[PDB]
Amino acid sequence: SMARAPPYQEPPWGGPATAPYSLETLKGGTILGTRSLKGTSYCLFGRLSGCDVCLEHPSVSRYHAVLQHRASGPDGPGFYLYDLGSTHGTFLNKTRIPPRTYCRVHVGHVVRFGGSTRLFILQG
Amino acid sequence: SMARAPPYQEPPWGGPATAPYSLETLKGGTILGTRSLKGTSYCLFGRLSGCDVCLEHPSVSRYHAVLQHRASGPGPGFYLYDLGSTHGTFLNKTRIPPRTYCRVHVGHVVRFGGSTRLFILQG
């Protein structure tokens, strides 16, 4: 069979995060760990082991969503959520975002994928 | 009926938040809602009805803590200040010292006493 394409193409405006932004995980009222976004151009979330963040919940799509960073100017931050046509949705605070549409993630905003219990907080 | 005034003195460096900052409230992995911090210098938390954020949990003090904004000059400056609460104020995974300003970076989590409610500073 013909080898599948990668699930996502980084847009021309994408680039690595240079400032010390991070993603903090919450699970059911409990603060878990923090993942640095420094040096990250984009973070791919999904149930497949090949994702940058591998979610276990069966409602999460194999390739679910991407958090894309906009290239920093020469010098707030430009992070955008992009749902890959997920089966059970991507949520930015309470809103289910439209598929395949870049949605700005302001600092402190919460992201949830499908029915996963994990919440991800963009932090500065 | 009505209570005494809170034991808080707005510091000289305090001033109103002009940018659209807010507090997102969570409980048990569920997002509850958002509280705008627009047009306020400080947000008072506690069990008394006079607080800006009124918590019902009995472990939350009558006047528990303040989130104080630093006056904008010519990262936002928000600082948490526990009013000597009996059962503590938590920032990140730490119970903060009483009556000490502690920087709350955007997206960081605040909790009061034994309450399961979480507050996230958002931009």
Swiss-Prot record, chain A:
It comes from the Eukaryota. Residues 43-97 form the FHA domain. Residues 4-14 have a biased composition (Pro residues). Ubiquitously expressed. It is found in: Nucleus; Cytoplasm. Isoform 2 is a prediction based on conservation with orthologs. This is Kanadaptin. It comes from Homo sapiens. The chain holds residues 95 to 222 of 742 of the full protein.
Swiss-Prot record, chain B:
It is found in: Nucleus; Cytoplasm. It comes from the Eukaryota. Ubiquitously expressed. Residues 4-14 have a biased composition (Pro residues). Residues 43-96 form the FHA domain. Isoform 2 is a prediction based on conservation with orthologs. This is Kanadaptin. The gene is SLC4A1AP. The chain holds residues 95 to 222 of 742 of the full protein.
